[PDB]
Structures are given as C-alpha cells and as structure tokens.
Amino acid sequence: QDTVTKKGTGNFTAHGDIIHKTYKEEFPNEGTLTAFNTNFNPNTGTKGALEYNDKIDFNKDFTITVPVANNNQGNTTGADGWGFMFTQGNGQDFLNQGGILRDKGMANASGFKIDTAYNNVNGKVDKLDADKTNNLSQIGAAKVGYGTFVKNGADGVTNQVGQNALNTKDKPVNKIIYADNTTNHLDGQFHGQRLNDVVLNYDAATSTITATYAGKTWKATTDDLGIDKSQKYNFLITSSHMQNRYSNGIMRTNLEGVTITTPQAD
C-alpha cells in the first residue's frame, strides 16, 4: 500500500506551554525534543497542545505515531499524562476548556489517554482514576498510571469507552508503569521515561482505532468515540500538570518523528 506522511513542527501548531531544546546527556541519540509543562507554577498548573494543521478523515485509514517520554515522578506529583484527542474544536478551545486527561474538558472531544496521575482535589478523585478494578490501584510514590480510550460527553464530562487492554496479564488490566529510574540508553527493558512510540492505527472498513503503547493494545470504534465519519476532525497532542504539585511535570516528544500517515488513494 502506498502512503503519504506529514511530520514535524512545520505541520503542527503549538498552544500554551510548549518549548523545544536538546537534552545532550539524557537523549544524546535525539535532536530537538519538544517539552510540555516546563512553565512550572504550582498555583495554576500548566498545559500545552500540538495541533495537527490538516484534518483527519475517518472515512479513510490512517496511522499516527507519537514518540513520548514520561516524567520520572510518582503519580501524585507528576504530569497528568498524554491526551491524543480528536475534536471539531481547536488548541485555543483546549487551553480554555481542557482536554481528555481530567474529569471534564472540551465537549464531545475523544481519543486515547496515557494517564500518569492520580488526580485528587481535596478528597475528590477524578472518576476514572478511582476505578481500582480496571485502571489504577497504586497511589503516591508509584510511577503507575493506565491507558484507555475516552469520550467527553455533550457536557464535557470524560468517560471511559472502548475495550480494556487486549493482550495483557496486568492487574489492573489498563496499567502502565510509565517511568522507572533506569538511565541506561541501550537496555532493552521497557522504560517509559525514554522515548517509546504511541501508535494509533485506524481501519476505516471496521471503523476501529487500535492504540499500541508499552506493548499493550486497546481498541475503540468511531461509535464508542461519538465520531461522525462524515465530518473532518482536528487532532491534538496534549499534556497538562495539575496545580499544587511541587516537582517538575515535564513531558517530552520528538516532533520530527510525530508522523500522520494516510493512503495515497482517495
């Protein structure tokens, strides 16, 4: 099958807390990495998005690949995670309303999240984080989170949709160990603080998105996500760091290896 690919800073628009720089000792194999959440402010928290400049057409196949490197922080102090979000709205709306990583964000937004935080506002826990059976039971110092597709309702409220992870023995099923203390660049164990690909592979014939990350696979249909295949969508890569957290929540990608690949056929 012949495909076309767009990538890199020329094809994404930054919104909010996004910077670019080298990390020579920690990522000597890499060029310019793109960092979210570096504007640290425990009074407000922070957030950022990268918005793809072209529309997503859910009547045709696509594969989206995003290299991510997670903060090496426990789930009560680090960043909220990564939200790979499809929406009729834009990055400006996201800065205004929020995304898919918390309790509520942009109305009708949907997509895949890597949730790296146990979010608790004075004893009120984000609903999906409180799901000890499917999602999350290790809280505090653990660098433990979870993956899942999600859909924001007409009211913005985030709900879990699609399938639980399809190829795992982990308990909870959706678990992701998103970082550890390894600094070795060659070691072949999975290390979520190093760069690892998120792959979103959409099959138009079956209306199904497959998400692969950390060797785990999730699936959701356009019907699960509320996606109208007759309408073109925007795609955003999002991250955020909650207020009242007192160490860095820096989350990084390599934008020149963020690829949006589609058939050359119409």
Q: Which residues bind Ca ion (CB under 5 A)?
A: 115, 117, 119, 129
- The Cβ of residue 39 has, within 10 Å, a number of other Cβ atoms equal to 16
List all residues 6 or more positions away from 191 whose beta carbon is below 8 Å from its beta carbon. Answer: 179, 180, 182
Structure tokens at 138: 């290790």
Token pair of 132 as six digits: 């000890």
Which of the 8 DSSP states describes residue 164? Answer: P
**CB 97 within 8 Å of CB 87:** no
**Amino acid letter at 201?**
N
Report the residue number, 50 or 242, with the smaller CB distance to Ca ion: 242
3-class DSSP state of 124: strand
Whole-number Cα distances in Å, 148 to 22, 84, 92: 31, 11, 25
Burial category of 133 from C-beta neighbours within 10 Å (exposed 0-12, middle 13-18, buried 19 and up): exposed
The nearer residue to Ca ion, 146 or 235, going by C-beta atoms, is: 146
Q: Please report how close the Cβ of residue 101 comes to Ca ion at its closest, in angstroms.
A: 6
In whole angstroms, give the CA distance from residue 12 to residue 161. 27
Residue carrying structure tokens 């937004």: 109
